[PDB]
Every structure is written in C-alpha cells, then in structure tokens.
Amino acid sequence: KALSAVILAAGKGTRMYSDLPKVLHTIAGKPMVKHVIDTAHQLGSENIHLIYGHGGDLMRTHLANEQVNWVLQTEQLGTAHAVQQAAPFFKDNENIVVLYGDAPLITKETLEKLIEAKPENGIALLTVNLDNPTGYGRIIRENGNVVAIVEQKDANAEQLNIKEVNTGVMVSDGASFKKWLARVGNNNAQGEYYLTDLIALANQDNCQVVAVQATDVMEVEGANNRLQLAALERYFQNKQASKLLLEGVMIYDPARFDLRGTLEHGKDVEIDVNVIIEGNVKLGDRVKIGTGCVLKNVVIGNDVEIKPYSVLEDSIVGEKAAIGPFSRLRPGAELAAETHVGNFVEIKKSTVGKGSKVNHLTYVGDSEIGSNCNIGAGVITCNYDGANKFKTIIGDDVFVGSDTQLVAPVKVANGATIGAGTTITRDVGENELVITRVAQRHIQGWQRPI
Amino acid sequence: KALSAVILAAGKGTRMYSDLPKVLHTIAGKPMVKHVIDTAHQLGSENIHLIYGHGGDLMRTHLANEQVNWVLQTEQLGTAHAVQQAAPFFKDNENIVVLYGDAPLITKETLEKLIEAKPENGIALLTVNLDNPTGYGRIIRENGNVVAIVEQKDANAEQLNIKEVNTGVMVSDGASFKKWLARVGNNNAQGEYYLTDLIALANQDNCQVVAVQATDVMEVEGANNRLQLAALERYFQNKQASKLLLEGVMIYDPARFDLRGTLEHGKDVEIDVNVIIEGNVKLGDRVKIGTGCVLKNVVIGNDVEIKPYSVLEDSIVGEKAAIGPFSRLRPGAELAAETHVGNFVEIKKSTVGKGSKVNHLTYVGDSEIGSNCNIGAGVITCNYDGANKFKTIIGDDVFVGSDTQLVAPVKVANGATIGAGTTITRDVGENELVITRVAQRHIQGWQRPI
Amino acid sequence: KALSAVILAAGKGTRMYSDLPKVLHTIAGKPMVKHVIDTAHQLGSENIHLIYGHGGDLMRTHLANEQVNWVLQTEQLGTAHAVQQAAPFFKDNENIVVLYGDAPLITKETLEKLIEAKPENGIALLTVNLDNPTGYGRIIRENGNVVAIVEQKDANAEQLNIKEVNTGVMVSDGASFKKWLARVGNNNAQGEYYLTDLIALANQDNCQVVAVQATDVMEVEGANNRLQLAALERYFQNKQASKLLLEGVMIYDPARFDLRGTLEHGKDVEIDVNVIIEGNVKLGDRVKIGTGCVLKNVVIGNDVEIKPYSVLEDSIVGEKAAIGPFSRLRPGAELAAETHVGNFVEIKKSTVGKGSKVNHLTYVGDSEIGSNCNIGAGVITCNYDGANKFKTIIGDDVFVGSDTQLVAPVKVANGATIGAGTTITRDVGENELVITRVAQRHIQGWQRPI
Ligand SMILES: CC(=O)N[C@H]1[C@@H](OP(=O)(O)OP(=O)(O)OC[C@H]2O[C@@H](n3ccc(=O)[nH]c3=O)[C@H](O)[C@@H]2O)O[C@H](CO)[C@@H](O)[C@@H]1O
Ligand SMILES: CC(=O)N[C@H]1[C@@H](OP(=O)(O)OP(=O)(O)OC[C@H]2O[C@@H](n3ccc(=O)[nH]c3=O)[C@H](O)[C@@H]2O)O[C@H](CO)[C@@H](O)[C@@H]1O
Ligand SMILES: CC(=O)N[C@H]1[C@@H](OP(=O)(O)OP(=O)(O)OC[C@H]2O[C@@H](n3ccc(=O)[nH]c3=O)[C@H](O)[C@@H]2O)O[C@H](CO)[C@@H](O)[C@@H]1O
C-alpha cells in the first residue's frame, strides 16, 4: 500500500511565550516541524499534508522550500477537524499516518513498525506508559484489546489512574479516515472534534485497533513549553553524538557537544569539549578541534589542528593547516595547505596561499595572499573613506613587517619586503624593499616619577 | 501567630579545608547563609537571630548589610546551646523556626507547611528518608508517633538501620523553647547539649510532636564539604534554569547555564550553551546570547545579538546593537542603539553613539564617541606618561583611520576624517582631514633568501 | 607471595575505526594501557609482561619509557595463547594477575582484594552482574561454587540468561598457570585458545575457584569502541573531580572540569566551569581560575586570578599576578609577582618583572622586561627579515608608548620613556625619552558624504 502523511502544526504554543508559532521553535538548529516533514519523506510518503494556522505568514516564510501540501486550518476546532482539512486529498487505498509538528523525534523505524501493525480496514496507534500520565488521552482496554481513548478532561477517577496513554500518532487507510471523521462530533468537555474518537468509532464498526507500545519515551514526546523542548534537544544531541562515536569520531564528552546540521568526517577525528558544529561541515582525516570552537559551514582538510576558541564560518582550510587559538575566519576565508593563522587574527573574504603565516593581532579582508608569505603582527588591510571596499593583492614570498597598514586598492609583487610600521598606498614591485624613514627626538636626562 | 527565625552558623567547616567559616562558601555567587536569611525574611520572620562564632570577623564583613540579630556563640557546645543564645529574645507567643546556614536550599513553601503542621504547645520537625542515613539523627517512632531523636554516635545497632532522619529543622513556640532548653543536659557520647533532645522532652510533657516528611531530598541537604556544596550548586542552577525555561527563555542546555544573581528578561530571548549571568542583568525582547558569554551587571536592549566569547561588565547596550565575538566591555561602557563592536575590541568607561562601529583590534577607554562614527581597526586611545588619565572626545560622523593613536586629552569635532597610521595629539576641527605624510626608502633588486 | 602482571594489549580495535591500535586511545590524555601499567606498578608487580601485536611500532614509540617486558604475540590466537607468551617468565611461587590494556579503570584496591581472595593452588577471578550480559563469558555456578566460564558464542539458551559475567581479570600462581595453559585447546566456536578454560581445568584438578564480585561496574568495563571510551572518560573525570573537591578545591561544576595529568593545589582554590588542566600543574593558595581557561604545564603562585578564556602553557606566574581575560601565555613565559597581563595579549619565551603591566593588544616574544614597566596597548616585538630571532631587553621602570614596534636585537635601559607610535631600532639609554616626530597634512573644509 502507498502512504501519505498529515502533520498537525496549527497551534499557537501559548506556553512557549513567543511571537513564533509552536512548531517553528528549533531542535538542533531547525524547526521541530522540519524534523517531522523529513521523517515523513524518508518513510516514503507520497503526499505530506501540513495543517497550519497560527503564525501562518511565519510558517510560509520559514518553510517556503518544504515539499508539502499547505492546508490552512482557519479555526482550531480539534484534532479531527484538523485532519479533515486534508481528508479530501486522501486516496481510498493508501495508508495515512498522522503526525505532529511539536513531536519532532519520532523515527522512521518506529513508524514503519506502526504501519506494519495496522490491520486491514482498522487502525494502528502508538501508545506509551508514563509514571505521570496527566494531560494525555488514556488507553481503554477491554479483555486486552483497545476499544477507546478517553481524554484527561473527560475521564472519571478510575480512568485517570491508567498509565498507558495516546501519543496522538495513528495510521489508517484513506477511505476509513473519511468514513469515521464524518461521524466525529464535539459533545465532550472541551467542545472539540477529537481525532481520538476514531478508536471507539472503529470498534463500533467491528474493525480492529492495534496499539504499538513505544519503548523509548522521549522519542514520542511533544514540546508544549521550552523546558520540554530543552529535554528534547539534549536527547537528540546525545543520540547524534553517540552515532558519531560509534562511527569512530573521538568526542571527548558527548554531553558537551552540539551538532546543528550535518557532519561528514574522516578517520581519527578528535573533538574536544564544548564544540558547536553548524550547517554543513566536512572534516578530513586526523582533524583535531580544540575546546570552545564554533565551525559553521566549513571544509577542513586532512591533518588540520584547530586550537581552542576559534570561530570559523563559510571557510575552507587546506591540509596540514594550523588555526588558533583565538582565530576568527569570516565568510570567504580560504586557507591553502600548510598555512598558519594565530591568535587574535581575523580573516574575511580572502585567500591565503600555501605555507603562508598570519600569526598575531591582524586583520586581513578582501585580500589575495600568495604562497610562503610572512604577514607580521599588527598588520591591517584597510580602505580610504570612500564608497565600496577594494582589494589588496600580495604575491608569493612576501614579507610584510609588523604594524604595516595595507591601503587598498594595492598590489605587492612576488618577493617584496616591507619594513615594520609602514603605510603602503602605492603598488610595490617584484623584489622591492620598502622601509619607513622615521624622525625621532631624543631627550636625555628625562626622569620619570620616582 | 507571629514568627521569628534562628539560624545556626557558628561552625568552622573543617572539611571544607578553608580559611573561611563554613557558611560563607557560596551557592550561585552568594554565601549559603545569605540564601537562608532571605528565605527566613520571605517567610515573614519578625526577627532573624544569627548564631555566629568561628570566622566572626569574616562573617561580619561579608554579611554587614543583613537584617539580622548578631548572636555570638563563644563556644560551640551543641545545637541546643546555640539556640539558647537567642532564647532570651523569643516572644512567648511567637513561633520560632530553627534553620542552618549550611543548608541553603530550604524553601519558603516547605517551611510554611512545617509551621502549619505544628500542634499547639508542641513541635513540628522536618524529616527525610535516606538510603544511607549514616551521620544523621534517627527518628524514633512508637505506634506511628515520633517520641525521640537518637544521634548516630548514641544509637544502638537496630536504631542505625532506621532510614528516617532529622533534617535539624523544627518549629515550636517561644515559651516552649525556653522551657525545654533549660532541661537539656549533655550526658551523651559527644558531651554536647543536643537540640534533638527537645523531641523526647516534649513527649515527656505529653506535648505533640509532628514530623513533616520532605519529598525533595536535596532541598534539605546540608553541605559539610565542597563535594556536597557542588551537588547543591548543580541542583540550584537546574532549578533556576527550569524556571526561566517555563517563563519562555530559550536556554539551549540548562545543564550548561549559570545564573549568579538576578535575570530580568523579555520574550524570545535565546541563550546558547556555557553562558554565565552574574549580578543584576536585564535582557530585552529577542536578545540572543552566543556560546561562552559572561554578562555581569548589564542592561541589554531589545534585538541585541551578543556573539560568542564576549565578556561584558557594568555596561549598557542599546537596541539592535551587535557585539562580539571576542568583544570585551569593561565597566562604564555605554553603547547606543545600532552600534557594532567586533572581535578583539576592548571598551572601557566610554560612550559610543548611535550607529557607530568599532569592529576590530581596538582599545577605546575614557572616551566619548558620537553617532555614525567609523573607528578603524587597530585604533588605540592612550595617554602621556603623566598622572591621571584624560578623555578623548570624538564628535558625530567621524572617520578614524586604521592604526591611529588618539593621545588624550584630545577632541575631534563632527565630520572630521583621520588617515590611517596617524598620531593625533592636537584637537581636530569640524570637517578637518588629517593625513600622515610618510617618508619611505625604496630599494630595488632586494632578493630575499631562496 | 611475590606478584607479577600480564597485560593483554595486542588487539587491533577494529570498532574504534582508527589507525591506532586499540590500547593507545587515551583516557585523561594518556593511553588506556598506561593507566593499567601504572596500576600494576602500584600493586607492587615485580615484572609487567606487556603482550603486544597490532600496531607494534606505534606501541613501542608511544610506550617507549614504560618499565615493562615487551612480549610480541605475532598471531592473536586467543587469550590463553597471549598469556602463554609470557608464561616462561612466570616464577612458580609468585602470583600472576591478568589485566587488559583496554580496561583502564581497574583500581589497586580491587586487585588487592582479588589477590587476597585467591586460595592456595587455585584461582581468584573478578566477576560482575550486568542487566545486559551479551558478549561476555557467563559464570557457571554449581551449588554456589564457580566451576566454569562459558563464552557467548559457545553458550546454550539457558546459559545466555546468566547475568553474572567474567571481567577477564584473574590471579593464580605461576606454576598453576604453566600447568593449565598447556592443557588449553581450541575446540570451540571461535577456534581460539580461551584463557577462560582455566576455570574448568582448575575444577578438574580439584583446585578452588573463588569469584570476587566487583561492586562498581564501570571500574571493570573495557572499551571496544569510542562510545564506551567516552563513558570511561566521564567516569574517570568525575572520580578525579570528586577527589579534588574532598581535598578542598572549589570546582563549580565537576561535570564541566577536565584533568589530563596531575594537579597540585593549595587551599581556597576556585575553578570555574569549563576549565582544562593538562600536564603537570601547580596552583598556590587562593588561586582563582575563570571560565574557559586551559592550563598546560604551569606553575601559578598564591593569590593569582586568571580571568576567563585564558590559555597558558609551559609558563610560570608569580604571586598576586592578574592574567586575562583572553590572555595567551606560550612556552617560556615567566611572569613575576604582581604583574598584569590583559586581553588579546600574547607572551612567548619572555620574562616580565615584578609589577609590570602588559594590558592590551600586544605581542611580546623573546624578551626580558624588568620591574614596574608599562607596556602600552598595541606594542609588538619583531625582527628583521633575517635568519634566527633575536632578543628585546627592557630594563626597570620603562614606559613603552602605545603602538610602538621594538625591533630586535635592541636594549632599552632603566627609566626610559618611549612615545606612542615609535619604531625602536637603536638602543635606548638610561632616562632617555624618545618621541616620534610626525609630519601631517591638514585639509580644511573636507566634507564626508551626507
Ligand atoms: C483530542 C486529542 O487528539 N488528544 C490527544 C492530544 O492531546 P492534546 O491536549 O495535546 O491535544 P491538542 O488539542 O493540544 O492537539 C495536539 C496537537 O495538534 C495540534 N492541533 C490541535 C487542534 C487543532 O484544531 N489543530 C491542530 O493543529 C495542536 O496544536 C497540538 O500540537 O495529544 C496527546 C499526545 O500528546 C494525546 O494524549 C491525546 O489523546
Ligand atoms: C545534635 C543535633 O542537632 N544533631 C542534628 C545535626 O547533626 P550534626 O552532627 O550535623 O550536628 P552539628 O553539631 O554539625 O550541628 C549542625 C549545625 O549547627 C551548627 N552548630 C552546631 C553546634 C553549635 O554549638 N553551634 C552551631 O552553630 C554546626 O556548625 C552545623 O552547621 O544535623 C542533622 C541534620 O543534618 C541531624 O540529623 C542531627 O539530628
Ligand atoms: C575467551 C575470553 O578470554 N573471553 C573473555 C573476553 O571476551 P572477549 O570476546 O572480549 O575476548 P577478546 O578475544 O576480545 O580478548 C579480550 C582482550 O584480550 C586481547 N587479546 C585477545 C586475544 C589475543 O590472542 N591477544 C590479546 O591481546 C583482546 O585484544 C582484548 O583486548 O573478555 C571478557 C571481559 O570483557 C569476558 O567476559 C570473556 O570471558
């Protein structure tokens, strides 16, 4: 049988105390709902019907690229009413899985088990045993079989003691959904059309209802507030770190590691405590990342060491380079093999050729630097007070003395040597040595305070 | 009935291996005893009798501003002897709660329940069940009712198996305290006057003793050493972080967050991992704090982003400003709206006007900078080798070229432009352009080593 | 009885996905096998027979200084075959303890208990109860006594339910080892000579086998992959931090503290969250280390405060010094008492005398600086484009103005004063004042863009 998905995502999320709608709060740097859409896609869903409502404009801007059917629920009249908005698109002979944009950790594997357990013309639902089931629909079983779900606000004293609860997740065929949704009313304590009434309706039709008990409680947990969200984040980060460790990445402390995107890695990679990996990051063999580093959208070659407290974004680093500590690579930084970038150095939109060193207290922006250059401490690339920002071009085997200002646009040809304290405004030729002539006054017998 | 409190705080705390007395070790940046004094005050205590002894001078300097009755216990002859030092101040018809300066996490709510449970002319005490009750007074019950407490060193083999123990915390009326304290002896294994003998004395008077069992074990835990203290710290920080999360603050990892003071916050505030908030901090709406930041006594306006590894103290930042990464704001830094402070920049006792940028490798101290200024990389405010430290005043719409030294006292008027590499000692006028004239030697055919 | 040890360490460690052999992966900065060798030595082992094989060259380079008997196992034919390689060196009347280089946390105390429990002419082994014993040899008991070990791959369905398993660790006398090893075959599901067959062989000889049940499960755990290794690392770091806390070191959060070497400490030392201590570190009384610091091979005197995000290596800091935040001390940095090193300052192979300050945006390398000097912001020591790197010598009571370049080799004598923006190439005499003469152009009525 084919499969499509419906994702309920219309909620305001009042207890997040936010201007965002509930499902756009992030886990590992992306909206909760994006995790759910991705899972529905990996499961092989032909269509993904996204039920949205509150924060509609924000949903559409933040999820503009998602391959979903946008189904606007103008009023939040209950979970059955939400699913019914998508029901006209259900094929009679496909399975439909109901998912929630605020329950982001549900796995493909669990959902495949749920789908496989669904009986013909019946329903499969995911349930879970909780020590404290307050708030959740209670699973009612007669002679071992599920016959109904009773919500917290509708339950009598005995039913509230039931520890097995509804996760909300269920699967049935499209025809059965249409049939039963039309028979859902709103005669209950909340005045809502409950999706949960489908269980008792199916029982009334002598159709079978199978519960699959989820064994990992956090996997099926939803987030109603940011405390719950943080619990999901920690669970997810632990899971990601455990996968990387089993793949052979040495993460010194998995509880102090964060991945917010994707990590491609070689062998014998070592990542010290308190590292954050964001966006798409690729690390070669034997890359070592020191404590406190932030890498966002970077490619790091084999045998690179990044020393502590380095922040790198949208940058490429060649093999055997050495970066840090306290180095800053801003977007467009491209460091060739065997380069050295040191403490309190900022590189922005610049290329730095093989073997070159930029080891202290330096800003290099909008520059091209060749191979085997020595960029002294305190060197700064700058511009005139003009309009746009021009380029500094330095050739191969150039020595730039400490505290030199390179005033763009300017070119320094191969083999040139620039003395310390120089202001370079004119192009420097091949093998040209430029030294600043200083005038000083010397006053003898000057006594400082005793 | 009225209420007063007695806080036992005279202990040396030998197992802390410290020159401080036991109760001055901090939790969340303040002495344990300060947490207890604050709780006693919130409970509505009319008087707070602080029993002190060891490290007396240090107690008085560190707690100089606390609204307490200073009761010096010259010799530590037992918990009953300690309370008896305060007993002459007890009103006959007020309740007295006994608390300990080394048990800082006891809450107002728990103590209100304890006070409410006290029977007329009797005692209420807080007890707790422990898996390992070694060291603690055992609660002796006959026919369900508490009749005595037996200390570890006085207990027989059977009594040592009792898992219910005394937290030390009790409430009785002032008259009953005076009565029973006078009948406490020191015929026991420690030779001490035990406050715990009040339970058996009350039973001897046919007065009722009610135990309230505390359900949160850490809440009533004391710290005898720094390992126990660290456990209390973690518990307290988790509790603070959980409260903030429920209030709508996105704390990415509550286990890597520290608050050591007070935090006022707007909505949609995001705090990344490893942030420390100290003193009194106020954050506006949509403030984002990156990893590794330290904020101590700061006010941050709406929509400010603080990028990673920024350290800020005694500073004010206006709306829509951007700070970091690797920025340092020292006391007296005042940044207006829409300002930009970048990497390896230190600002001390300076005002920076709206729209101004200070983006790299710069020190600005004792300065006033106007609106829409461009403070170049490598700029430094400095002084003559003199006595005190004078001011640099920069107007609006000033461009300060890279690597310029501004030698205070000096003024640069509106619209002025200063070239790179300049040493400014004289005042610069409105719309004055100042460019350094350099002399250079150019030597052709200079071959660097091949 | 005497004692020697055999450490099995020949494994490839395939599931580490590494170019290193299994036992060279580190815990707390040293190879797992080094922890085991050290424990065997503290136990009083006369000989330590190291069985090695895979990654042999790497073993010999990384463990070159270890006092062990190098026993090469050319083929890994089973745990009995490994021990048999060392068996010719066993003395008949010494005890032999079998240990594993991939199980690094086993303590001297546990092994002393195991050795004491060994019956004459019999065997003592360490066992442990696991909820999931999959993979491990099951302990077979008849009438309470251990009679055999059955490996996972050889066990029937009933035996797989046994929760008591073999840790691998055992002790017997040298003569008994020789006797039983000669009778071990390889008729089993793996085709290997199992060391575990010694238990059933001993039972066949009517010799006694005693199991000592380990109560700390992590202590006896081995690491087959990096996930398991990370679990061992966290356990070990917690244990180290707990010891330091009980000794009186205030570690604000023991879960965010790492020691990778040895720490000697005074009293009232305070270490904030996310500090890493590497190599041999000594801290005096009342040393305070702020968040994010990395200290590797340093000596810190009494009353020093290291402010956040400081990185120090191979350096000495005198009493009452103040370092950080964002300070970098590279090897050979020696700071005298009452010195001050500030933000974005790098000191390398330099001495700095009593009372001197280097507070911002400065590089000092290969320098000697005297007492009570004032090294201004932006100061840099540099060299000519030459061969080797020469020294800058600054006397006592020298003022070096901001943004000055000191071009080595150069000497500045006591009491000298150097103006801001100066390039110093010639020696400066005692009480000599050196001021740069600048030429500037002033252009009035220069309007910047409106
Ligand atoms: C009636 C119902 O289904 N109850 C289930 C629901 O309770 P619960 O009380 O959580 O039901 P809610 O009404 O919050 O709806 C669940 C989710 O669907 C979304 N939403 C809801 C209504 C709507 O008209 N539009 C829509 O987009 C909500 O924003 C929320 O994200 O969640 C649990 C799983 O946690 C179960 O234990 C309950 O059995
Ligand atoms: C006799 C007594 O009360 N025992 C209680 C006490 O045992 P414990 O053995 O902890 O009693 P201690 O003698 O340490 O006194 C408790 C506290 O009161 C302070 N102090 C004590 C004596 C003194 O003369 N001056 C004073 O300021 C101590 O420094 C300490 O902070 O603590 C426990 C709660 O943890 C209980 O289980 C015990 O029933
Ligand atoms: C037959 C045997 O002893 N089984 C024990 C072994 O199983 P396990 O299946 O772990 O046995 P392995 O064969 O992995 O050997 C254990 C260790 O000895 C080393 N090695 C092994 C063989 C060899 O010829 N050379 C050598 O250096 C391995 O690399 C490994 O580090 O470990 C467990 C403890 O975790 C026990 O529960 C098992 O009862």
- Phi, psi dihedral angles at A76 (to 5 degrees): -90, 80
Within an 8 Å CB–CB cutoff, is residue B227 touching chain A?
no
Tokens of A319: 């093999």
Query: Cβ(C100)–Cβ(C9) under 8 Å?
Result: yes
Residue C378 to residue A245: CA distance in whole angstroms: 44
Residue A399 to residue A379: CA distance in whole angstroms: 11
Angle in degrees, CA B111, B112, B115, rounded to 5: 85
Residue C101 to residue C223: CA distance in whole angstroms: 9
Tokens of A46: 């032909």
Experimental technique behind these coordinates: X-ray
What Rg value do the Cα atoms of chain B yield, rounded? 31
Domains and CATH numbers, chain C: 1-224 (3.90.550.10), 225-450 (2.160.10.10)
Q: Is there an atom of ligand 2 within 6 Å of B137 CB?
A: yes
Residue C326 to residue C343: CA distance in whole angstroms: 5
Helix B226-246 and helix A226-246: axis angle, to 10°?
Answer: 120
Mutate to test the pocket of ligand 2, among B23, B33, B71, B79 (most ligand atoms within 8 A of CB): B79
- Phi, psi dihedral angles at C294 (to 5 degrees): -125, 120
Q: Nearest C-alpha to atom 37 of ligand 3 is from which residue? A: C136
Give the distance between the most distant pair of CA atoms in chain C: 109
The separation between the first and the last C-alpha atoms of chain C, rounded to the nearest angstrom, is 94
Tell me the three state secondary structure of residue C193. Answer: coil
Residue C155 to residue B442: CA distance in whole angstroms: 86
Distance from chain centroid for Cα B412:
42
- Phi, psi dihedral angles at C258 (to 5 degrees): -135, 125
DSSP C254: G
CB contact under 8 Å between C431 and A447, yes or no, is yes
Cα–Cα separations (whole angstroms), residue A21 to A12, A14, A59, A101, B266: 5, 8, 8, 11, 17
Distance from chain centroid for Cα A399:
42
Q: Is the dihedral of CA B84, B88, B92, B93 positive or negative?
A: negative
- Phi, psi dihedral angles at C110 (to 5 degrees): -60, -45
Residue B323 to residue B305: CA distance in whole angstroms: 6
Element at A359 (helix H, strand E): strand A357-365
Chain C partners within 8 Å of A436 (Cβ): 423
Query: Cβ(B306)–Cβ(B326) under 8 Å?
Result: no
Query: Cβ(B21)–Cβ(B54) under 8 Å?
Result: yes
DSSP A119: P
Query: Cβ(A350)–Cβ(A365) under 8 Å?
Result: yes
Q: Is the dihedral of CA B372, B376, B382, B384 positive or negative?
A: negative
Contacts of A300 (CB under 8 A, 6+ apart): A281, A282, A283, A284, A287, A306, A317
- Cis peptide before A409, with omega less than 30 degrees from 0? yes
Residue A32 to residue B3: CA distance in whole angstroms: 50
Tell me the three state secondary structure of residue C257. Answer: strand
Ligand nearest to the CA of C165: 3
Residue B227 to residue B216: CA distance in whole angstroms: 19
Cα–Cα separations (whole angstroms), residue A441 to B354, B361, C234, C419: 40, 29, 62, 10
Within an 8 Å CB–CB cutoff, is residue A87 touching chain B?
no
Tell me the three state secondary structure of residue B396. Answer: coil
Contacts across the B-C interface (CB distance below 8 Å) = 150
B79 is in an annotated binding site: yes
CB contact under 8 Å between B420 and A415, yes or no, is no
Cα–Cα separations (whole angstroms), residue B261 to B30, B280, B282, B298, B403: 8, 6, 11, 12, 39
Tokens of A233: 């984040």
SS3 content of chain A, % helix, strand, coil (to 5): 20, 35, 45
Element at C39 (helix H, strand E): helix C32-42
Looking at chain B, which residue has its C-alpha nearest residue A21? Answer: B268
* Closest to A106 in 3D by CA, of A292, A239, A198: A239
Q: Which residues pair with C160 in a beta bridge?
A: none
Within an 8 Å CB–CB cutoff, is residue A403 touching chain C?
yes
Query: Cβ(C120)–Cβ(C146) under 8 Å?
Result: no
Residue C118 to residue C121: CA distance in whole angstroms: 8
Element at B311 (helix H, strand E): strand B311-317
Residue A74 to residue B135: CA distance in whole angstroms: 64
The letter for the amino acid at C33 is: V
B32 Cα to the center of ligand 2, angstroms: 16
CB contact under 8 Å between B20 and C444, yes or no, is no
The letter for the amino acid at A337 is: A
Element at C113 (helix H, strand E): helix C108-117
The letter for the amino acid at B66 is: E
- Cis peptide before C409, with omega less than 30 degrees from 0? yes
Query: Cβ(A405)–Cβ(B405) under 8 Å?
Result: no
Residue C338 to residue C373: CA distance in whole angstroms: 12
Q: Quick one: which atom of ligand 1 is closest to the CA of A224?
A: 31
Residue B198 to residue B173: CA distance in whole angstroms: 12
Ligand nearest to the CA of C86: 3
A233 Cα to the center of ligand 1, angstroms: 21
Q: Which of C25, C54, C81, C360 is catalytic?
A: C360
Residue B231 to residue B222: CA distance in whole angstroms: 10
Residue B133 to residue A2: CA distance in whole angstroms: 61
Query: Cβ(A211)–Cβ(A144) under 8 Å?
Result: no
Contacts of C324 (CB under 8 A, 6+ apart): C290, C293, C305, C306, C307, C308, C309, C310, C341, C342, C343
- Phi, psi dihedral angles at C21 (to 5 degrees): -70, 165
Question: Hey, what's the torsion of the CAs at C348, C353, C357, C363, to 10 degrees?
Answer: -20
Residue C282 to residue C268: CA distance in whole angstroms: 14
SS3 content of chain B, % helix, strand, coil (to 5): 20, 35, 45
- Say if strands A138-142 and A145-150 run parallel, antiparallel, or are unpaired: antiparallel
Within an 8 Å CB–CB cutoff, is residue A309 touching chain C?
yes
Selecting from B15, B233, B328 the residue whose C-beta is nearest the C-beta of C252 gives B233
Residue A141 to residue A132: CA distance in whole angstroms: 19
* Closest to B10 in 3D by CA, of B30, B24, B28: B24
SS3 content of chain C, % helix, strand, coil (to 5): 20, 35, 45
Query: In Å, how far is C350's CA from the nearest CA of chain B?
Result: 23
Chain A partners within 8 Å of C362 (Cβ): 361
Contacts of B2 (CB under 8 A, 6+ apart): B46, B91, B93, B94, B95
* Closest to B48 in 3D by CA, of B24, B22, B67: B67
Element at A311 (helix H, strand E): strand A311-317
Tell me the three state secondary structure of residue B67. Answer: coil
Helix B174-181 and helix B197-204: axis angle, to 10°?
Answer: 100
Residue B414 to residue B122: CA distance in whole angstroms: 78
Q: Is there an atom of ligand 1 within 6 Å of A51 CB?
A: yes
Question: Exposed, middle or buried: residue A59 (CB in 10 Å: 0-12, 13-18, 19+)?
Answer: buried
> Which CB contacts under 8 angstroms, 24+ apart, belong to C443-450?
C443/B432, C443/B433, C443/B434, C443/B435, C444/B429, C444/B431, C444/B432, C444/B433, C445/B431, C446/B417, C446/B431, C446/B432, C446/B433, C447/B415, C447/B431, C448/A385, C448/B397, C448/B399, C448/B415, C448/B417, C448/B431
Mutate to test the pocket of ligand 1, among A18, A52, A79, A186 (most ligand atoms within 8 A of CB): A79
Q: Nearest C-alpha to atom 25 of ligand 3 is from which residue? A: C76
* Closest to B51 in 3D by CA, of B87, B19, B17, B27: B87
Residue C177 to residue C94: CA distance in whole angstroms: 11
Tell me the three state secondary structure of residue A279. Answer: strand
The letter for the amino acid at A92 is: D
C61 Cα to the center of ligand 3, angstroms: 24
Tokens of B351: 């005002």
CB contact under 8 Å between C254 and B230, yes or no, is yes
Query: Cβ(C332)–Cβ(C316) under 8 Å?
Result: no
Question: Exposed, middle or buried: residue A387 (CB in 10 Å: 0-12, 13-18, 19+)?
Answer: exposed
What Rg value do the Cα atoms of chain A yield, rounded? 31
Residues of A noted as catalytic: 360
Q: Which residues of B344-379 are buried (b: 16+ CB within 10 A; e: fewer)?
A: bbbbbbbbbbbbbbbbbbbbbbbbbbbbbbbbbbbb
The letter for the amino acid at B329 is: L
- Phi, psi dihedral angles at C405 (to 5 degrees): -100, 125
Query: Cβ(A49)–Cβ(A57) under 8 Å?
Result: no
Q: Which residues between 235 and 294 in chain B have a beta carbon less than 8 angstroms from any beta carbon of chain A?
A: 242, 245-256, 267-268, 272-274, 291-292
Contacts of A157 (CB under 8 A, 6+ apart): none
Where do the DSSP E strands lie in B73-116? 95-100
Query: Cβ(C382)–Cβ(C364) under 8 Å?
Result: no
Residue A449 to residue A447: CA distance in whole angstroms: 7
Cα–Cα separations (whole angstroms), residue C246 to A100, A150, B50, B133, C218: 49, 53, 28, 20, 21
Q: Which residues of C327-352 are buried (b: 16+ CB within 10 A; e: fewer)?
A: bbbbebbbbbbbbbbbbbbbbbbbbb
Query: Cβ(B50)–Cβ(B158) under 8 Å?
Result: no
Tell me the three state secondary structure of residue A83. Answer: helix
Q: Is there an atom of ligand 3 within 6 Å of C81 CB?
A: yes
Cα–Cα separations (whole angstroms), residue A363 to A400, B374, C152: 13, 16, 61
The letter for the amino acid at C156 is: N
Distance from chain centroid for Cα B77:
32
Q: Which residues pair with B280 in a beta bridge?
A: B262
Query: Cβ(A329)–Cβ(A315) under 8 Å?
Result: yes
* Closest to C199 in 3D by CA, of C220, C168, C175: C168
DSSP B421: T
Give the distance between the most distant pair of CA atoms in chain A: 109
Count of CA atoms in the C-beta half-sphere (13 A) of C188: 20
Resolution for this PDB entry, in angstroms: 1.9
Residue A207 to residue A189: CA distance in whole angstroms: 27
Query: Cβ(B363)–Cβ(C361) under 8 Å?
Result: yes
Distance from chain centroid for Cα C240:
12
Q: Look up tokens 């059917």; give the residue.
A: A69
Give the distance between the most distant pair of CA atoms in chain B: 109
CB contact under 8 Å between B273 and A258, yes or no, is yes
Within an 8 Å CB–CB cutoff, is residue B355 touching chain A?
no
Ligand nearest to the CA of C170: 3
Query: Cβ(B253)–Cβ(A235) under 8 Å?
Result: no
- Cis peptide before B104, with omega less than 30 degrees from 0? no
Tokens of A369: 């630097």
Question: Exposed, middle or buried: residue B254 (CB in 10 Å: 0-12, 13-18, 19+)?
Answer: buried
- Say if strands A433-437 and B145-150 run parallel, antiparallel, or are unpaired: unpaired
Residue A396 to residue C312: CA distance in whole angstroms: 34
* Closest to B167 in 3D by CA, of B229, B92, B217, B115: B217
